Design an enzyme around this catalytic site. Structure first.
Site, PDB file in Angstrom:
ATOM      1  N   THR A 221     -22.312  11.476  21.259  1.00 36.89           N
ATOM      2  CA  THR A 221     -21.139  10.667  20.954  1.00 36.89           C
ATOM      3  C   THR A 221     -20.212  11.379  19.972  1.00 36.89           C
ATOM      4  O   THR A 221     -20.662  11.936  18.972  1.00 36.89           O
ATOM      5  CB  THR A 221     -21.541   9.301  20.367  1.00 36.89           C
ATOM      6  OG1 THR A 221     -22.463   9.495  19.286  1.00 36.89           O
ATOM      7  CG2 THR A 221     -22.192   8.432  21.432  1.00 36.89           C
ATOM      8  N   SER A 222     -18.914  11.359  20.267  1.00 32.45           N
ATOM      9  CA  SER A 222     -17.900  11.943  19.392  1.00 32.45           C
ATOM     10  C   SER A 222     -16.697  11.010  19.380  1.00 32.45           C
ATOM     11  O   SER A 222     -15.971  10.920  20.375  1.00 32.45           O
ATOM     12  CB  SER A 222     -17.501  13.344  19.856  1.00 32.45           C
ATOM     13  OG  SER A 222     -18.583  14.250  19.732  1.00 32.45           O
TER      14      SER A 222
ATOM     15  N   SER B  56     -22.272  11.948  17.118  1.00 32.20           N
ATOM     16  CA  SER B  56     -23.176  13.093  17.070  1.00 32.20           C
ATOM     17  C   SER B  56     -22.418  14.388  16.798  1.00 32.20           C
ATOM     18  O   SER B  56     -22.775  15.151  15.893  1.00 32.20           O
ATOM     19  CB  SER B  56     -23.963  13.192  18.378  1.00 32.20           C
ATOM     20  OG  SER B  56     -23.097  13.383  19.484  1.00 32.20           O
TER      21      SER B  56
END
Ligand SMILES: [Mg+2]
Ligand SMILES: [Mg+2]
Lengths: 195, 221, 232, 204, 196, 242, 244, 245, 249
Positions: free
Chosen positions: E1-2, E129
């Site tokens: 996830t970003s 992340s």
């Protein structure tokens, strides 16, 4: 564990229970009666974890005596066995189960028949001509499979129980300080004076 | 197991295998894994089969009650939300992983729900053990504006990949097509490629082979 | 009055609560007690009522903390419940905040504790009226609490049978007793004079009188029996 | 140890032309120590039979509870319960204790009184219905029973051939399991006749 | 996830990837990680997908009730709702949420809620992340009161770097722009940000 | 006896508290009507602000339940606001649990079931209010559904409620018997508002200013109340008509 | 608050009687007539179905005779709904006893359980008692055949032959005139049918208006025969009350 | 047809009224006078405290109560019921601030109090509130003044009054609304409230009184609710004492 | 605080339950509904009385689908009937379908609704239901059936009956005109005649409601592929069918 044996002959039912209760490394008592009379013609021997045994046995005894007083009638051994197996089955799934195994010996007056029921703490029940709980079975069941007969008398069953007790005292590490023997028949429950 | 769902220009198809495994042993060689939530909203389950069946029956009953109360056609988003909230309430202790497709007044819908309460949407989805083989086929053959027959063939090929290449899936393929204008059509055992071969010997025992001790009639009336 | 005095949940056509008024009348029948204060000290004098000559004089003053107490007029058990609630409130203040409970806040709490009974069906309003004296960081304080919930801060007051005598006496003696600062005995004598003014055919005896005193450099202290013989 | 592997026992149900069969071993024991050879594991309610393998206390509890429920069903509906309805009832009852399950493996068999179709079904410990037409197996010798049934079974056989097949399967599966044996019973169920036969087998 | 959210002159822009992975497998490469809790209040989610989705659903319910009762809620209101949910259930939640909202009174605002339920208002917030890999870069390129195009380019560069370095991030770059004109949805494909 | 005090049956089999709540509905002395357009729905209510000390913007009997559902209440404002809060909560809960906006008829059925619970349970008295929900449902179209303290609810092509409800109802009936259609065949919602206001003027026999009316308009995915300026614009457009 | 509306169902009269108990007994006196007769070789129950219409389907209707278990049955006089509720609870208690003891429940235990429930309703809760009277016909392996009666008061009694419902006094007098301890099941059927035909408020006693049931031994197995309408018509024409 | 419909709360008379609510209104009419005046950027509250005896400590026994840090409340009738109501309002505002961080809006707080008072008229087990409450304050949308009745009915007012002299006060309030379309100043509102209290005291001229004033203004109180005491209190009281003769 | 824990329906000294009789009176004052059982189906019918022509007739359904094989109609108080239909739909699943995997038979659903209404007549702080219900149904083991349920909680089967205002005349008409060999369409016609006798306003397909428990409708299932599953037997009649059968009359 403790010695809990039972045999069903043609005319009576004989139950034998160890006399020794030991806590820690010391044999605390050598004359303990591990049986509770549920009804004048139905006796129950019990063994298991300390405390749970006496509590559960006296609870069953009080319930049976209450039912007997209410209906002015003695419950059949089969009904008492079903009651006890239901109580143990409810117990095992409670917060703290009862860890007590019981032998129920009774005389059904409606059928004039002797009945022996073995019930473990999990709620498993069976009707057997001879039964035991714990390690006693491992020694006694061969002797009973060999010698026991359906038409045996009370004295023959007592001889078989004496042979079982001798084999136990010979091939067991635990000193159970002998056994107490009780016979249930049409005249009620009685205890052998000396074995 | 191997379950897939593919959307086409006028609806959505789902497909699954027909083999339930009790550990390494095939318990049922033809277990239908397509469950009906609503007459036009179906789903395929994976994981704990009992949990999938139970959640599908509960959500279908509640959806029927909701449709009778509101007097409207059931919506796929309603099944999605109810399933997601129920699965999240138990924090994944209900091991059901579902691919839920359907048609409603709002159009065609295809979603996937995980046991912990997660939900995702897409045009092609796959779940189960053989889900990777099926997903490979879906990534190799999917295209926009699929027809009914094209989506049916794609789902069948994905389930075939999951059957041949994955040990958890096998036997036959069940399909359910849900179009916008027609009733849902449920093809039980669409393809039958694993038909068992004939045995080399018939093992009919000669009567009296078994030793019988005692026989008696029991009353049933 | 007639069909509107069955419970505290029904208003009268004129907007009255007759059960609360009957509780106030129960207060009126209670023995007379009177409280007064100065900027340094606060005194509560009370006449306990014996049923017969062989009966004991019921202690009508209750200590709530080391800085606050009260005197009761009416039903003794309701006074006990209210004083116990006030003790618990002062104890909670001192324990949780290391802070003596303000007399005004205690009055608000007693007001709400009385109101919660006069609005819900069942039970009853309290059958006692209280006079609360205290000495907090704001100085000396005297409060009059009625079971209707109205708690009022006063320089001096009285409740019970024929309390109007002592009340009008304190009203006349306001400029005198409000400035008796630095001397407790004179304020006690003033309270004794008030409670004597509110007497009919009775005389203050060493058994009948009860005194309570709070103030600066003085904890809440009760004087009964021979301790009051100096003010007879 | 393993709750399902404390008492042992095996049940197997099969289907043939207008008939079903359900057989079970008679052994009950505490781990290695066999305690009773008179523990039947097949019960009957109306015309629907139910075998139960696993923890014996749960077997008895489920037998009594389903007897209770089927009696109330007969009193309310004024008719005997059908095998499919009883299968759904067993499934729901098993799932009702999902987070505290019964260590059992129920197997339902029977013939629907109205349709006359032979019906068998199996359950896990949480109610998942395995509705196979060929055969259902349960117990400690589930793999041996699976092999015996997959090798011997062929559909549309008379009740006598069905009896022979299911008896051979049960016997040769129990003789490969330490926790099974000590006697076997076989019920052959046809539309209007139920025969119960005890089998002779090795007693070890 | 970003995920990230940046405030600029004309409002706010939220950006995220579309890669949701179960371990090392790309479970979903077309995931919309921007969730709308109100007309002009959106949120970027990271962590347990089920937990974040449930929190978003409950926040949307609460904001709809707030709209029906007392009118349009501010961005701080939705941020406080998210904060209360994450803090009072911190023992069973694994969610990091970036809440960005544009209102006519306070222009655009960005709050971030890291694990533990804490809430912090930032001109721009980054999480997920891959966020780590693009920390310094962002601190070297972020500016106050940027235009829409340069803000889009900044978010695109940051998310492309995060996707390239982090194996848990990838797919397409999805952006939601909240401005006085309303809500705009932008999608940028791999060939655009990979070539950067 | 006491059969007139709680929600129990009288010897005639009638619930007197329900009838008294029906009577209390007209306590506000305000009339309202609802009509359906081609793609919109319009509610008009008499806005009466007697005392000049009131803030006239805080005097309203129309409530914005959800983004799609509006509700006009005939009855005292306490029970009106109670029903409004309950309806908003129910709509939000429905949107949360089932994933789509609560339909007009569904909210009407829920409120009617609550009224029925009030009608059968003694511990709660019915709300002396008549609720008229209006929306543009996606599945149905323009929707007007009315519920009463008796737990009864039903949908109308057009409806009226209040003291002079009979007159307004008869007027709308006459108009829809002449046009022989079940809706106002006008595309714009402003003209439907003007139609409703004109027919209210005709029925009540009194003229209104921009301070005497409350207008609620529901169109596809938006319910909104008109300002006093828009109401005055509609009244001017009506004055310039024939 | 709500104190004014409290009927106080569980209160004593100045004489020492429960108002609601007497009123429910009066209600039952308006209900149908149920009669049980215990003969040396079985028990018979006979009841009069109040509802009459040409369009009523008597075949599937059983308003007065119900089955508690396989060995006990009941005849109800009064409200059918309260009766069905109590009968469902009785079936549940019987099945509970069976599950607990693996033995059929004795008749007196079930009767006493139901009577204690009724008593609890006439002592606490402030609720109306069940307007239902029960005639229990049962067989257990201790006392054999047993006939019991229970009323809303919560009291139960045992009888050789007994009736509840409408015209209790006249029916009891007729039974006492025609009852013998040595009679058999068929004589008991005749007696019950005659008592019903003589204590009925209708013009004539037809098969549509009544139900019959018999707990017999037909083996060492008891059996409950619930009489179908045609069997009722046949027993009617055989006893002479009706004609083919 | 019938009688005794006024003996139980939440019971509808044949006309459609709740007589217990009107009896509570009668109880509030017996109470002292209390007024509220909305200015341009805030509100002002004023109340008359009857001096039953001169033994009462002046400037004590306060009647106006503060909710949150921006809401003022005064009530006429049974003071304990008013304290109960302000306690419930404080709980509602605390919950609102806990969940939403922003101080509760005045319309929201008014609706909360109204729903509470209304629920107190739904069951025969509870007695309707014996107070009429004038409250309000300043929020992001500006100044708001509300008045709430025992029936649960509440409205937004330019000026509000309740008590024995309410009518006279109301009349004076209308004069203000008639003679100031642009609006009053916060200090001018305080002075005028002092005047109106002195005027409405004439109905209760039997016993002496004490005036209590509070205000919540953006420019003069920075948005917070503050008691008017000290020099401004003396200025307003002198204004009223001069205007009385 | 709810303190209505005491029963509202008690026994009068005359031996009657007052509130139950009053509910029966309210039923008698309700619009007449009727039911007729035939050889292969049951018919339920009632009048859809509209207070105003502005109201839409479809928005008020007196016939309601309980299960795919069980429908119901009422006479009495509308809202009580609506809440009863909701509770019956819920109990049909939560008590029988979620346990036995099938929809309950007619008699069991009728018994459940009767238990609900009996509890209404006995529970504390609750009035009985001012409704009488006519429930038509079909199950595989009991065939077709038609039951009537009263406020007291009693229920009984009927070959044909009616309740409401014109109960006596409708019942007398049905007694003379019912036979055991009647087909479904003949029963529909007889129901139309009986309802026509009990109507004063307009009598067409838009003013009366009628439903039939007859054959299975596989087209009304919504899905195909499972031969074991069959279509619902409950079917509400359209206005066009009713008008066609009325013009044929
Ligand atoms: Mg494979
Ligand atoms: Mg072996």
């Amino acid at each position: 564990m403790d010695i809990i044996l039972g045999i069903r002959v043609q005319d009576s039912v004989i139950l034998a229970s160890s006399k020794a209760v030991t806590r820690g490394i010391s044999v605390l008592k050598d004359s303990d009666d591990k049986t509770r009379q549920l009804s004048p013609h139905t006796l129950m021997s019990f063994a298991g974890e300390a405390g749970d045994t006496v509590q559960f046995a006296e609870y069953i005894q009080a319930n049976i005596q209450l039912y007997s007083i209410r209906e002015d009638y003695e419950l059949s051994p089969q009904a008492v066995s079903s009651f006890v197996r239901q109580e143990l089955a409810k117990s095992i799934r409670s917060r703290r189960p009862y860890q007590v195994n019981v032998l129920i010996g009774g005389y059904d007056k409606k059928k004039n028949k002797p009945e022996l029921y073995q019930i473990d703490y999990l709620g498993t029940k069976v009707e057997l001509p001879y039964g035991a709980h714990g390690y006693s079975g491992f020694y006694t069941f061969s002797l009973l499979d060999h010698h026991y007969r359906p038409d045996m008398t009370t004295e023959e069953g007592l001889d078989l129980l004496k042979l079982c007790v001798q084999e136990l005292e010979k091939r067991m590490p635990m000193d159970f300080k002998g056994v107490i023997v009780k016979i249930v028949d049409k005249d009620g429950i009685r205890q052998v004076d000396d074995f | 197991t191997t379950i897939v769902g593919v959307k086409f220009n006028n609806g959505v198809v789902i497909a699954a295998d027909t083999r339930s495994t009790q550990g390494p042993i095939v318990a049922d060689k033809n277990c239908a894994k397509l469950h009906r939530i609503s007459p036009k909203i179906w789903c395929a389950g994976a994981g704990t089969a009992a949990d999938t069946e139970a959640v599908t029956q509960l959500i279908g009953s509640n959806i029927e009650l909701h449709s009778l109360y509101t007097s409207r056609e059931p919506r796929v988003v309603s099944a999605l939300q109810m399933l997601k909230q129920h699965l999240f309430k138990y924090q994944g202790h209900i091991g059901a992983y579902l691919i839920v497709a359907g048609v409603d007044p709002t159009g065609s819908h295809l979603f996937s729900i995980h046991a912990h309460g997660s939900t995702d949407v897409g045009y092609y989805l796959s779940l189960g053990s053989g889900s990777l083989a099926a997903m490979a086929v879906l990534e190799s053959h999917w295209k926009q504006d699929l027809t009914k027959e094209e989506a049916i063939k794609l789902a069948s090929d994905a389930i075939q990949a999951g059957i041949w290449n994955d040990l958890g899936s096998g036997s036959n393929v069940d399909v359910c097509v849900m179009e916008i204008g027609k009733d849902a059509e449920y093809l039980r055992n669409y393809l039958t490629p694993n038909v068992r071969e004939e045995k080399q010997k018939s093992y009919k025992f000669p009567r009296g082979t078994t030793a019988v001790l005692k026989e008696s009639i029991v009353n049933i009336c | 009055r007639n069909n509107y005095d069955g419970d505290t949940v029904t208003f009268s056509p004129t907007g009255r609560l007759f059960q609360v008024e009957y509780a106030l009348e129960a207060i009126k029948q209670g023995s007379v007690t009177v409280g007064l204060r100065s900027n340094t000290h606060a005194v509560l004098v009370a006449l306990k009522r014996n049923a017969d000559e062989l009966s004991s004089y019921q202690k009508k003053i209750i200590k709530c903390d080391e800085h606050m107490g009260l005197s009761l007029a009416g039903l003794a058990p309701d006074a006990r419940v209210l004083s116990n609630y006030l003790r618990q409130q002062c104890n909670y203040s001192s324990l949780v905040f290391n802070r003596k409970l303000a007399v005004e806040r205690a009055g608000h709490l007693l007001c709400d504790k009385a109101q919660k009974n006069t609005q819900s069906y069942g039970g009853r309003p309290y059958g006692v009226g209280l006079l609360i004296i205290g000495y907090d960081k704001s100085g000396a304080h005297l409060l009059e609490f009625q079971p209707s919930g109205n708690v009022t801060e006063l320089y001096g007051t009285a409740i019970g049978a024929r309390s109007q005598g002592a009340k009008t006496y304190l009203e006349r003696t306001l400029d005198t007793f409000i400035k008796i600062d630095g001397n407790p005995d004179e304020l006690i004598k003033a309270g004794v004079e008030a409670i004597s003014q509110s007497l009919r055919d009775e005389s203050l005896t060493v058994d009948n009188l009860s005194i309570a005193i709070v103030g600066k450099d003085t904890p809440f202290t009760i004087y009964d029996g021979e301790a009051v013989a100096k003010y007879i | 140890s393993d709750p399902s592997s404390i008492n042992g026992g095996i049940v197997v149900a099969m289907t043939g032309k207008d008939c079903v069969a359900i057989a079970c071993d008679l052994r009950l024991g505490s781990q290695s120590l066999g305690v009773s050879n008179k523990f039947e594991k097949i019960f009957h309610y109306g015309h629907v039979f139910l075998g139960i393998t696993g923890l014996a206390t749960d077997v008895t509890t489920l037998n009594e509870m389903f007897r209770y429920k089927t009696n109330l069903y007969k009193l309310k509906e004024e008719r005997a319960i059908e095998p499919e309805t009883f299968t759904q009832l067993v499934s729901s009852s098993l799932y009702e204790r999902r987070f505290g399950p019964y260590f059992v493996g129920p197997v339902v068999a029977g013939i629907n009184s109205k349709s006359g179709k032979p019906f068998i079904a199996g359950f896990d410990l949480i109610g998942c219905i395995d509705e196979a037409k060929d055969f259902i197996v349960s117990g400690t010798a589930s793999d041996q029973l699976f092999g015996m049934c997959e090798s011997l079974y062929e559909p549309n056989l008379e009740p006598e051939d069905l009896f022979e097949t299911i008896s051979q399967a049960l016997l040769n599966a129990a003789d490969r399991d330490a926790l099974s044996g000590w006697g076997a019973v076989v019920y052959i169920i046809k539309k209007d006749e139920v025969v119960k036969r005890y089998l002779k087998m090795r007693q070890d | 996830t970003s995920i990230m959210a940046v405030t600029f002159k004309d409002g706010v822009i939220l950006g995220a990837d579309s890669r949701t992975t179960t371990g090392a497998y790309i479970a979903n490469r077309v995931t919309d990680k921007l969730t709308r809790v109100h007309d002009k209040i959106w949120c970027c989610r990271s962590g347990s997908a089920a937990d974040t989705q449930a929190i978003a659903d409950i926040v949307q319910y609460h904001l709809e009730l707030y709209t029906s009762q007392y009118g349009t809620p501010s961005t701080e209101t939705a941020a406080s709702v998210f904060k209360e949910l994450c803090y009072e259930n911190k023992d069973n939640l694994t969610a990091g949420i970036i809440v960005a909202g544009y209102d006519d009174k306070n222009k655009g605002e960005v709050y971030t809620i890291p694990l533990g339920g804490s809430v912090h208002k930032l001109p721009y917030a980054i999480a997920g992340s891959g966020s780590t890999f693009i920390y310094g870069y962002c601190d070297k390129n972020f500016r106050e009161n940027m235009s829409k195009e340069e803000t889009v380019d900044f978010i695109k560069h940051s998310l492309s770097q995060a996707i390239k370095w982090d194996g848990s991030s990838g797919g397409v770059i999805r952006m939601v722009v909240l401005t006085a004109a309303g809500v705009e949805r932008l999608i940028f494909y791999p060939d655009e940000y990979e070539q950067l | 006896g006491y059969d007139r005090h709680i929600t129990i049956f009288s010897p005639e089999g009638r619930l007197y508290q329900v009838e008294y709540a029906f009577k209390a509905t007209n306590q506000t002395n305000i009339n309202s009507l609802a009509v359906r357009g081609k793609d919109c729905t319009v509610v008009i209510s008499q806005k009466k602000v007697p005392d000049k000390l009131l803030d006239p913007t805080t005097v309203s009997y129309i409530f914005c339940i959800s983004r799609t559902i509006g509700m006009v209440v005939n009855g005292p404002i306490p029970d009106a606001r109670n029903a409004a809060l309950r309806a908003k909560a129910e709509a939000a809960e429905f949107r949360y649990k089932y994933g789509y906006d609560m339909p007009c008829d569904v909210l009407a059925k829920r409120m009617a079931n609550l009224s029925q619970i009030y009608t059968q349970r003694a511990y709660m008295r019915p709300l002396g209010v008549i609720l008229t929900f209006v929306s543009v449902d996606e599945e149905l179209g323009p929707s007007i559904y009315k519920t009463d303290p008796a737990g009864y609810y039903v949908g109308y092509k057009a409806t009226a409620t209040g003291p002079k409800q009979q007159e307004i109802t008869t007027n709308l009936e006459n108009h829809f018997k002449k046009s022989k259609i079940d809706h106002i065949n006008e595309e714009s919602w402003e003209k439907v508002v003007e139609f409703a206001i004109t027919h209210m003027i005709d029925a009540l026999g009194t003229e209104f200013s921009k301070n005497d009316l409350e207008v609620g308009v529901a169109t596809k995915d938006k319910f909104f109340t008109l300002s006093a300026e828009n109401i005055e614009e509609r009244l001017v457009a009506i004055a310039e008509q024939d | 608050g709500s104190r004014r509306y409290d009927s106080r169902t569980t209160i004593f009269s100045p004489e020492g009687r429960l108002y609601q108990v007497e009123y429910a007994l009066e209600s039952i006196s308006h209900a149908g007539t149920a009669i049980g007769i215990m003969a040396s070789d079985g028990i018979v129950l006979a009841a009069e179905r109040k509802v009459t219409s040409t369009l009523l389907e008597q075949d599937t209707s059983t308003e007065k005779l119900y089955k508690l278990n396989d060995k006990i049955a009941v005849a109800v006089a009064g409200l059918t709904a309260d009766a069905e509720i109590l009968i469902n609870t009785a079936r549940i208690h019987a099945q509970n006893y069976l599950k607990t003891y693996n033995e059929d429940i004795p008749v007196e235990i079930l009767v006493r359980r139901l009577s204690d429930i009724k008593q609890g309703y006439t002592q606490h809760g402030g609720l109306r008692p069940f307007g239902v009277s029960f005639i229990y016909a049962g067989y257990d392996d201790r006392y054999g055949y047993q006939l019991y009666t229970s009323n809303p008061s919560g009291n139960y009694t045992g009888w050789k032959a007994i009736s509840v419902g409408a015209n209790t006094s006249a029916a009891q007098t007729l039974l006492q005139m025609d009852y013998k301890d040595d009679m058999k099941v068929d004589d008991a059927i005749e007696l019950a049918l005659k008592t019903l035909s003589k204590t009925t408020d209708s013009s004539a006693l037809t098969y549509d208006r009544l139900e019959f049931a018999t707990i017999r031994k037909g083996d060492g197995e008891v059996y409950q025969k619930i009489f179908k309408p045609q069997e009722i018509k046949d027993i009617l024409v055989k006893t002479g009350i009706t004609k083919k | 047809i019938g009688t005794g419909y006024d003996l139980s709360n939440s019971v509808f008379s044949p006309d459609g009224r709740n007589f217990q609510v009107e009896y509570a209104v009668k109880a509030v009419e017996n109470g002292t006078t209390s007024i509220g005046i909305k200015c341009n950027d805030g509100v002002v509250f004023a109340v008359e405290k009857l001096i039953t005896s001169k033994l009462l400590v002046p400037q004590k026994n306060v009647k106006i109560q503060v909710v949150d840090r921006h809401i003022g409340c005064v009530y006429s009738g049974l003071i304990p019921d008013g304290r109960h109501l302000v306690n419930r309002g404080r709980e509602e505002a605390a919950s609102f601030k806990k969940l939403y961080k922003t101080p509760i809006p005045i319309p929201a707080f008014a609706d909360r109090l109204g729903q509470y008072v209304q629920a107190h008229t739904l069951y025969n087990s509870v007695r309707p509130f014996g107070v009429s409450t004038i409250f309000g304050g300043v929020d992001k949308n500006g100044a708001h003044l509300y008045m709430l009745e025992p029936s649960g009915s509440y409205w937004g007012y330019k000026g509000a009054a309740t008590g024995k002299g309410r009518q006279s006060a109301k009349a004076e309030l209308e004069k203000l609304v008639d003679h100031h379309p642009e609006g009053l100043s916060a200090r001018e509102a305080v002075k005028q409230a002092a005047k109106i209290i002195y005027l409405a005291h004439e109905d209760n001229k039997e016993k002496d009184f004490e005036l209590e004033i509070s205000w919540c203004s953006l420019s003069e109180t920075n948005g917070l609710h503050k008691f008017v005491k000290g020099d401004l209190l003396q200025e307003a009281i002198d204004f009223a004492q001069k205007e009385i003769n | 605080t709810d303190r209505y824990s005491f029963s509202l329906t008690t026994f009068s000294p005359s031996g009657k339950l007052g509130q139950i009789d009053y509910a029966l009176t309210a039923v008698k004052q309700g619009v007449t509904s009727l039911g007729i059982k035939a050889t292969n189906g049951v018919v339920i019918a009632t009048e859809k009385k509209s207070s105003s022509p502005l109201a839409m007739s479809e928005t008020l359904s007196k016939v309601s689908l309980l299960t795919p094989d069980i429908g119901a109609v009422y006479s009495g108080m509308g809202p009580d009937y609506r809440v009863l239909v909701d509770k019956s739909r819920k109990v049909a699943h939560t008590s029988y379908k979620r346990i036995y995997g099938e929809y309950p038979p007619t008699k069991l659903l009728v018994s459940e609704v009767a238990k609900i209404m009996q509890e209404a007549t006995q529970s504390g702080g609750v009035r009985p239901f001012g409704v009488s219900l006519l429930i038509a149904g079909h199950d595989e083991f009991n065939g077709f059936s038609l039951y009537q349920v009263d406020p007291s909680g009693s229920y009984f089967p009927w070959k044909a009956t009616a309740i409401g205002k014109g109960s006596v005349a409708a019942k007398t008409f049905l007694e003379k005109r019912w036979n055991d060999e009647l087909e479904l369409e003949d029963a529909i016609h007889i129901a139309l005649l009986t309802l026509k006798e009990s109507v004063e306003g307009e009598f067409n397909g838009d003013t009366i409601e009628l439903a039939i428990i007859g054959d299975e409708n596989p087209d009304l299932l919504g899905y195909t592929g499972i031969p074991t599953d069959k279509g619902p037997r409950f079917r509400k009649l359209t206005s066009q069918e009713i008008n066609d059968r009325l013009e044929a009359l």
